Amino acid sequence: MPGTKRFQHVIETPEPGKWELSGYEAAVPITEKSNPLTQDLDKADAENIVRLLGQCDAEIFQEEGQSTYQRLYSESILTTMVQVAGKVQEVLKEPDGGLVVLSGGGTSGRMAFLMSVSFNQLMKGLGQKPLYTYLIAGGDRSVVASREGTEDSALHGIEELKKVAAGKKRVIVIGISVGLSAPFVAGQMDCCMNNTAVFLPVLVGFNPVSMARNDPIEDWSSTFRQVAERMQKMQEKQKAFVLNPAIGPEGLSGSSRMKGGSATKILLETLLLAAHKTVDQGIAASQRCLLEILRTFERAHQVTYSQSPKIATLMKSVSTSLEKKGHVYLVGWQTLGIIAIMDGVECIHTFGADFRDVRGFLIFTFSQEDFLTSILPSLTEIDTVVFIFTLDDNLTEVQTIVEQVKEKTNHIQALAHSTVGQTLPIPLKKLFPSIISITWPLLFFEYEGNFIQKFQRELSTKWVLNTVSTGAHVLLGKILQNHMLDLRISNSKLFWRALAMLQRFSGQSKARCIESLLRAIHFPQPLSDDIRAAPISCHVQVAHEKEQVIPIALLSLLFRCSITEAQAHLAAAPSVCEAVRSALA
Numbered sequence: 317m318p319g320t321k322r323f324q325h326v327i328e329t330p331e332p333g334k335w336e337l338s339g340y341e342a343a344v345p346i347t348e349k350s351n352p353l354t355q356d357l358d359k360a361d362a363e364n365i366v367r368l369l370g371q372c373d374a375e376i377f378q379e380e381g382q383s384t385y386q387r388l389y390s391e392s393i394l395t396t397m398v399q400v401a402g403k404v405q406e407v408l409k410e411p412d413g414g415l416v417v418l419s420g421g422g423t424s425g426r427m428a429f430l431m432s433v434s435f436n437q438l439m440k441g442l443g444q445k446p447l448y449t450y451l452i453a454g455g456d457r458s459v460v461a462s463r464e465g466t467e468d469s470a471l472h473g474i475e476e477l478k479k480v481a482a483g484k485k486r487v488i489v490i491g492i493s494v495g496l497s498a499p500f501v502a503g504q505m506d507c508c509m510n511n512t513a514v515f516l517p518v519l520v521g522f523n524p525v526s527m528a529r530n531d532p533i534e535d536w537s538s539t540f541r542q543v544a545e546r547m548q549k550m551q552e553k554q555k556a557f558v559l560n561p562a563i564g565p566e567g568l569s570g571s572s573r574m575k576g577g578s579a580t581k582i583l584l585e586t587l588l589l590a591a592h593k594t595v596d597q598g599i600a601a602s603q604r605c606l607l608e609i610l611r612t613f614e615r616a617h618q619v620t621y622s623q624s625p626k627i628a629t630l631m632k633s634v635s636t637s638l639e640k641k642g643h644v645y646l647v648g649w650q651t652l653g654i655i656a657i658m659d660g661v662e663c664i665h666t667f668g669a670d671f672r673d674v675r676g677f678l679i680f681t682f683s684q685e686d687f688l689t690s691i692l693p694s695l696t697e698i699d700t701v702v703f704i705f706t707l708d709d710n711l712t713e714v715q716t717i718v719e720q721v722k723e724k725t726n727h728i729q730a731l732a733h734s735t736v737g738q739t740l741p742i743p744l745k746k747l748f749p750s751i752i753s754i755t756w757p758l759l760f761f762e763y764e765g766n767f768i769q770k771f772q773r774e775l776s777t778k779w780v781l782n783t784v785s786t787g788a789h790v791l792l793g794k795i796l797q798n799h800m801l802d803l804r805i806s807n808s809k810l811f812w813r814a815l816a817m818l819q820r821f822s823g824q825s826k827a828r829c830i831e832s833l834l835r836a837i838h839f840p841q842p843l844s845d846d847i848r849a850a851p852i853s854c855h856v857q858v859a860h861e862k863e864q865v866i867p868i869a870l871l872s873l874l875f876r877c878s879i880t881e882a883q884a885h886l887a888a889a890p891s892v893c894e895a896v897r898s899a900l901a
């Protein structure tokens with residue numbers, strides 16, 4: 317029947333009370349789940365939110381129990397990290413025609429970028445040709461843009477991979493997809509396996525292979541699950557690798573920008589730093605080298621969230637300025653400005669927020685005086701600005717821009733990273749009464765740029781800005797339980813999430829939910845057979861452009877009413893959220 321082909325794989329809604337015993341819950345991949353810690357995220361205050369998201373982030377480093385899934389510290393995972401380090405070593409020894417590609421969509425793509433930079437720096441500072449590069453769904457401009465739509469083509473992913481791998485003789489393709497989900501990566505990984513004389517595919521993500529995505533990809537015949545399952549078979553013979561520790565669900569369900577992005581850094585920095593630092597020692601990388609780095613990254617979470625009350629504040633101030641109708645600027649130097657841009661840009665798709673709402677700036681990439689003459693002008697009593705720099709940066713360029721901004725705002729706060737017993741120029745740096753001073757022990761670093769110190773700092777900042785940005789929006793009443801209900805359906809995955817959110821919140825059948833969602837999307841056109849049988853891309857292309865699609869469909873189901881009636885109901889409510897909450901009653 318029409319639709320059947322497209323919706324066959326969707327599990328039916330369970331009868332109430334049997335969500336567990338139906339085996340529905342067991343079919344939800346770890347990455348897609350509701351985190352139980354955050355069931356009441358919507359109710360928590362800023363200080364609680366920082367606690368709950370810190371707890372959620374800590375789960376990355378939690379160990380395996382005694383019938384269960386491998387984690388970051390499990391032996392099978394560190395073993396794989398070791399073997400991959402080795403394969404990376406082979407390439408570093410023979411850099412003529414070698415290349416290392418890091419590839420993902422969205423934040424996996426953004427993370428790919430940073431790490432390609434860092435490791436390209438590392439080899440530069442040793443007078444080696446840079447062997448790293450990146451790939452992001454939608455080309456290089458995707459790095460600083462909200463472009464959720466571009467990850468759904470496998471032929472695209474393969475094309476971008478053919479370009480960059482030229483007439484190289486030996487390529488390592490690290491495909492990053494947190495959910496083991498992105499058609500962009502799946503095609504890349506599959507092509508790799510079809511030419512193993514040249515390619516070594518290494519898949520990174522945070523679900524068991526058995527929970528890998530399995531609905532059809534429009535321009536490709538295999539599914540992510542098939543591709544991954546076949547990569548796991550090749551791992552015996554050491555010609556593919558799958559690096560897939562569980563780290564537990566995201567605090568905002570499906571928000572893989574957060575733990576997934578962090579885990580991607582932790583996991584990949586760790587393993588690549590090990591590979592480099594141990595080739596010129598003439599020693600194989602060993603579990604023990606990896607562990608040193610991981611434990612350090614794990615200290616970094618403790619250090620970072622020991623500043624929790626100061627973090628909670630910056631949240632409250634960021635939230636205040638958006639409650640009014642202000643704007644928020646995240647001004648940061650080098651690498652950490654980038655992290656800043658990336659957080660701000662991610663607020664657009666994640667929260668359906670305007671590019672002005674949380675903006676990032678690097679010293680998007682503006683000069684000292686340029687920021688001074690351009691952006692400075694429209695700052696205002698209500699806004700918040702954030703300064704993110706180390707004490708190693710060039711604090712004269714810093715002190716200026718804050719001196720100036722002080723006069724227009726007064727809601728400044730800052731984020732400063734320091735080696736132990738560095739001091740903060742200007743003893744009346746007040747300026748910042750209540751700095752977020754994050755201060756780092758001395759570690760023994762032998763590489764010129766102190767990369768471990770860099771990585772730690774990036775991560776700690778990421779953690780702060782993610783918690784700040786995410787918490788700010790929750791506080792504004794925009795998150796339902798721990799779900800972003802009102803998301804813009806901008807790719808198939810979000811489409812599948814919308815449908816799931818309707819089954820879960822409504823409790824009604826799969827057919828009904830599907831009908832209400834498709835009616836909501838294509839309103840005012842009615843459901844025809846063509847529309848039922850259409851490929852998910854056609855629904856995505858049309859939903860991408862509307863507002864409140866999911867809430868409209870949810871009300872049509874709760875009220876057992878038409879779209880015409882549910883739009884009218886919503887318009888005559890004080891807000892979207894109250895319309896939804898009161899109707900969920």
Ligand SMILES: Nc1ccc(S(=O)(=O)N2CCN(c3ncc(C(O)(C(F)(F)F)C(F)(F)F)cc3-c3cccnc3)CC2)cn1
Nearest residue numbers: 344345349350495497527528529569809812813816817820
């Ligand atoms: N490994 C992956 C990744 C993505 C996908 S997906 O794009 O096809 N889609 C992802 C999200 N997804 C779900 N999203 C949300 C839910 C919820 O129930 C939960 F509470 F768990 F978050 C929600 F309440 F939000 F709806 C469930 C799923 C889900 C449901 C059943 C099977 N698989 C995923 C459906 C599958 C499938 N497999």
Ligand SMILES: O=P(O)(O)OC[C@@H](O)[C@@H](O)[C@H](O)[C@@H](O)CO
Nearest residue numbers: 422423493494495498571572573
């Ligand atoms: O790495 P995945 O599971 O393939 O996810 C890829 C992207 O969709 C993901 O990074 C998304 O853009 C983020 O907004 C999620 O917070």
